[PDB]
């Protein structure tokens, strides 16, 4: 079965690829776009204001082959801030499609 160390190595590469994108991807059309980020789980691109942002289930997941068309979601508000969880500075995310 899939080991911790195999999963850590894949995560490190996912992170490396994400950091490359964060650095190299060109600026968004306006500063009202929400900002790209790596949140330790997924690599988020800039977001259009007032829209859902979707990215593929992270490929380092042990069960990635069982969620090949799954997406995780954030919502980018019209103010250029990611939608936040109540009582929290943390962003709302829906990762239900990527669960084992």
């Amino acid at each position: 079965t899939v080991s911790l160390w195999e999963t850590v190595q894949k995560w490190r590469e996912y992170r490396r690829q994400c950091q490359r994108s964060l650095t190299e991807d060109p600026p968004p059309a306006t500063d009202l776009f929400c900002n790209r980020t790596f949140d330790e789980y997924a690599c988020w691109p800039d977001g259009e204001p007032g829209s859902f942002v979707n990215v593929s289930c992270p490929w380092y997941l042990p069960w990635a082959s069982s969620v090949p068309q799954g997406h995780v979601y954030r919502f980018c508000t019209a103010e250029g801030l990611w939608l936040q969880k109540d009582n929290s500075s943390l962003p709302w995310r829906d990762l239900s499609e990527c669960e084992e």
Binding site: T1, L4, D39, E40, P62, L90, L95
Partner: peptide, 28 residues
């Protein structure tokens, strides 16, 4: 039924799953 090797594989599998859960929490 279940064998010891099922338990040992379960435990290895859980090490990776706990790592994922830790990432989902923000790796804090």
């Amino acid at each position: 039924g279940t064998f010891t090797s099922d338990v040992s594989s379960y435990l290895e599998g859980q090490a990776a799953k706990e790592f994922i859960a830790w990432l989902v929490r923000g790796r804090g």
